[PDB]
Amino acid sequence: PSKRSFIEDLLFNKVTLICAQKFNGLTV
Amino acid sequence: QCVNLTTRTQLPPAYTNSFTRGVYYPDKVFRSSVLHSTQDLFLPFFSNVTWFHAIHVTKRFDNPVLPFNDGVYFASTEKSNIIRGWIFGTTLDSKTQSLLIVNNATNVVIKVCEFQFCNDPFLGVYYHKNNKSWMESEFRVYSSANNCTFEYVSQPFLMDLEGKQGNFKNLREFVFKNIDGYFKIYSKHTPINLVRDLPQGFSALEPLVDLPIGINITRFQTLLALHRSYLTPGDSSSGWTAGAAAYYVGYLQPRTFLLKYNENGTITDAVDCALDPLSETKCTLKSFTVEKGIYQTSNFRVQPTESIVRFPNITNLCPFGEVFNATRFASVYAWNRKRISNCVADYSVLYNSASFSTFKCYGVSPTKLNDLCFTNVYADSFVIRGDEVRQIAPGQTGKIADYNYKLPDDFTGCVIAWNSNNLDSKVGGNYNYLYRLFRKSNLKPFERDISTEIYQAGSTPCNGVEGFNCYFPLQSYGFQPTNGVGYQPYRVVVLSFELLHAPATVCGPKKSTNLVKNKCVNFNFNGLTGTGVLTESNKKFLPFQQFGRDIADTTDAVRDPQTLEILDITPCSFGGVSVITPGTNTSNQVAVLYQ
Amino acid sequence: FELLHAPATVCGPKKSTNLVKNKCVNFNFNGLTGTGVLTESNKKFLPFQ
Amino acid sequence: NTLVKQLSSNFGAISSVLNDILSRLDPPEAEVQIDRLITGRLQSLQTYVT
């Protein structure tokens, strides 16, 4: 679907509360 | 009241816009080549003010009373001196210290007194035809001046008293402020030349006076003048001539303006700090030429619209007749314990019952009792002596606070103590109350000791016979009206309760209203106040839990005391604001970005 | 009279001193206390500051 | 997670909710507690920023 290969797709899958933190100043 | 004028076709007031007015010095500090921001009372730029006309040479004379707010900006475009004096007060009926500042043709009078103003106070000179002289005649301001507080008369001078016609030639700007009773007036004069409307430009404002008065100024009014000569029909009740000048009155708001100080130390430029994103960037960067980039500003906040109140419907009232000032209580070693629940509590129904002597609430404000919901109300009532009242306090010593009643260190509750000599004092002495002398050990908090055994002082075993070093613990007092004040009996009641710990039902007399969802408004549940949106929930609670806390230690869900439903609290303060600018020299438009 | 009540305007007497420069001494102007040398300046302020 | 849990600490007070303190005590008395909470949170934020 994107412009990546197979090794890149495998490496992206190996690397991995939000609103509760954002409701107190901690924004991303 | 007094007299009035007829044929006054008062035109409806119009709304106009200013052009950067009300820029004075913040204090007596010299600043040069430095951009400093203050927080006083100025006039917002490009604001909307009201324009009042006074041209007659048709038939226009309107000068009502205007409320005095935080700072007043008064602009006056004249050409022949039309605006005369000013009055400040509240009711203006010889019952409030009124200030009158008049600029007479001979002296400048400033009187803080108690004048009796009429419905339309004014001045009026008379112009003769055979001779060219301007003398004052009508002075319809006050009827009598009795009491006064301050009087100031300036030096005698010579005023021309102009009265020609044409175009505006003078602009007088006045800024009035009241800080800690001190009334500060700043005056500025400018010899302009224009037809009507309001002239533009920028100019500094030099201070004029700082009167160290101390009155409560609520309203004010401006007294003008009238010309009477050969153009009048021949009466002072209907013929008048206001003149030809304009005056603008505006209210000052606590704004923030950044001033530009050059090498001379004079204010030559003022930039607003809350109007446009470019103005906000210039205020933050403390400069004038903003470079190309992007800057984050304040977060987006939603202002509340309504305020709902939620409390359980309670009809029963807590009886205070038998609790405070009844008829007969117990001693100190066996205090009377009472439970109070399922009723509306209030402290405003205690002052009319009996005049107390001491009332102190540890851990809770005495005037904030109705704003919370009581939980487990325990009343410990007893009667002691006036010499041991100060000992009953969380963090004291003595014998009564150690061998009778005990108060914890972190105790949160109220204590009341009042004298009772009408009933607890006999002619021969009241021997119905007993106190414990000494004890082997201490006492745990909230513990009743009814041990009537023989106390042991040291050696020599008693074995129940009362002999050497064998004194009785329970001893009598000596309440007699023939002694002093400290020997009189005092009834002391300690009211202990919890604040947001268990689902109770005491609360206060605050009635409930309606219920609105999907809106960021205020709410109050069992005394706990909050602001947000109350959305529907789907979780399951327990029949002994009210509020709910998560990892952030905040009220996530709340149970309604009437509908018995769970509502989730969601804050609406969530969002970022950014201003993107391409440069000051490039253009003046920016872009607003919402994250 | 009164003490620490209402905006005052009439106080008591006060002792005055001389004017000494080119010395690192102490001075008190309008309540502000300083310690240093009071040298001659070349700029002027506003007739109210 | 540590910054989130820091909001539950007391720093020598009675609670961690500002509204709970403002509703139980008068303003001219909880100023010291508010100052202590602000100082503790500022120290935590300074450590986190470091």
Task: List strand residue ranges (DSSP E) for B420-479, in order.
Answer: 434-436, 474-476
In angstroms, the first-to-last Cα distance of chain B is 63
Distance CA D30, CA B233 (A): 72
Q: Measure CB to CB from residue D4 to each of B368, B499, B552 and give the nearest one.
A: B552
Distance CA B401, CA B535 (A): 50
Q: Which two tokens stand for residue B452?
A: 């009537």
Tally helices (H) and strands (E) across chain A. 2, 0
Looking at the complex, report in whole angstroms how far the Cα of residue A15 sits from the nearest Cα belonging to chain B: 26
Residues facing residue B138 across a β-bridge: B124
Distance CA B69, CA B219 (A): 8
Distance CA B208, CA D21 (A): 47
Residue of A23, B525, B521, B547 lying closest to D7 (CA atoms): A23
Contact list, B266 vs chain C (CB under 8 Å) = 46
Residues facing residue B523 across a β-bridge: B530
Give residue B94's region: left, alpha or beta (phi > 0; psi -120 to 50).
left
CB-neighbour burial class of residue B74 (10 A; exposed 0-12, middle 13-18, buried 19+): buried
- B291 contacts: CB under 8 Å, gap ≥ 6: B581, B583, B584
Q: Which two tokens stand for residue B225?
A: 């003048």
Q: Any contact of D with C, at least 3 CB pairs below 8 A?
A: no
- B16 contacts: CB under 8 Å, gap ≥ 6: B48, B49, B50, B51, B197, B198, B248
Question: Residue type at B319?
Answer: P
Probe site for chain B from D10, D16, D17 (most B CB atoms < 10 A): D17
Task: List strand residue ranges (DSSP E) for B429-520, in order.
Answer: 434-436, 474-476, 489-499
CB-neighbour burial class of residue B530 (10 A; exposed 0-12, middle 13-18, buried 19+): middle
CA atoms within 13 A on the CB side of B575: 10
Q: Measure CB to CB from residue D8 to each of B499, B527, B553 and give the nearest one.
A: B553
Contact list, B530 vs chain D (CB under 8 Å) = 19
Q: Within a 10 A sphere around the Cβ of B123, how many other Cβ atoms? A: 19
Phi then psi for residue D10, to 5 deg, are: -105, -30
Residue of B446, B444, B470, B445 lying closest to B458 (CA atoms): B470
* Residues B160, B171 contacting (CB under 8 angstroms): no
Chain centroid to CA B71: 17
3-state SS of B498-513 is: EECCCCCCCCCCCCCC
Task: List strand residue ranges (DSSP E) for A1-28, in order.
Answer: none
Q: How far is CA B337 from CA B12, B447, B530, in A?
A: 71, 11, 35
3-state SS of B133-186 is: CEEEEEEEEECCCCCEEEEEECCCCCCCCCCCCCCECEEEEEEEEEECCEEEEE
Residue in chain B closest to A23 (alpha carbons) equals B574
Per 3-state DSSP, chain B is made up of helix, strand and coil in percentages (nearest 5) of: 5, 35, 60
Show which of residues 1-28 on chain A sit within 8 Å of chain B, judged by CB atoms.
20, 22-24, 27
* Residues B117, B134 contacting (CB under 8 angstroms): no
Tally helices (H) and strands (E) across chain C. 0, 2
∠ Cα B344 B345 B351 (to 5°): 135
**Would an 8 Å CB–CB cutoff place B208 in contact with chain C?**
no
Question: Residue type at B267?
Answer: I
Residue of B558, B541, B423 lying closest to B491 (CA atoms): B423
SS3 A7: helix
**Would an 8 Å CB–CB cutoff place B509 in contact with chain C?**
no
User: Residues B585-588: contacts with CB within 8 Å, 24+ apart?
Assistant: B585/B289, B586/B292, B588/B278
Looking at the complex, report in whole angstroms how far the Cα of residue B299 sits from the nearest Cα belonging to chain A: 10
- B173 contacts: CB under 8 Å, gap ≥ 6: B21, B22, B73, B74, B75, B76, B187, B188, B189, B190, B205
Distance CA B173, CA B186 (A): 8
Q: Which two tokens stand for residue B39?
A: 């927080």
CB-neighbour burial class of residue B71 (10 A; exposed 0-12, middle 13-18, buried 19+): buried
* Residues B323, B338 contacting (CB under 8 angstroms): yes
Question: Residue type at B507?
Answer: C
**Would an 8 Å CB–CB cutoff place D3 in contact with chain B?**
no
**Would an 8 Å CB–CB cutoff place B146 in contact with chain D?**
no
Distance CA B193, CA B191 (A): 7
Q: How far is CA B232 from CA B58, B122, B190, B387, in A?
A: 14, 17, 33, 85
Q: CA gyration radius for chain C?
A: 16
CB contact under 8 A, A20 and B576: no
SS3 D41: helix
Looking at the complex, report in whole angstroms how far the Cα of residue A23 sits from the nearest Cα belonging to chain B: 6
* Residues B222, B86 contacting (CB under 8 angstroms): yes
Phi then psi for residue A12, to 5 deg, are: -70, -30
Q: Measure CB to CB from residue A23 to each of B551, B571, B576 and give the nearest one.
A: B571
Q: Scanning the structure block, which residue is given the tokens 């509020």?
A: B547
Q: Any contact of D with A, at least 3 CB pairs below 8 A?
A: yes
CB contact under 8 A, D20 and B551: no
Residue in chain A closest to D45 (alpha carbons) equals A26
CB-neighbour burial class of residue A12 (10 A; exposed 0-12, middle 13-18, buried 19+): exposed
Chain centroid to CA B130: 61
**Would an 8 Å CB–CB cutoff place A20 in contact with chain D?**
yes
Phi then psi for residue B230, to 5 deg, are: -90, -10
Q: Any contact of B with C, at least 3 CB pairs below 8 A?
A: yes
**Would an 8 Å CB–CB cutoff place B551 in contact with chain A?**
yes
- B245 contacts: CB under 8 Å, gap ≥ 6: B54, B55, B76, B77, B78, B79, B80, B82, B83, B168
Distance CA B403, CA B44 (A): 68
Distance CA B192, CA B82 (A): 16
* Residues B130, B153 contacting (CB under 8 angstroms): no
Residue in chain B closest to C49 (alpha carbons) equals B28
Contact list, C43 vs chain B (CB under 8 Å) = 32
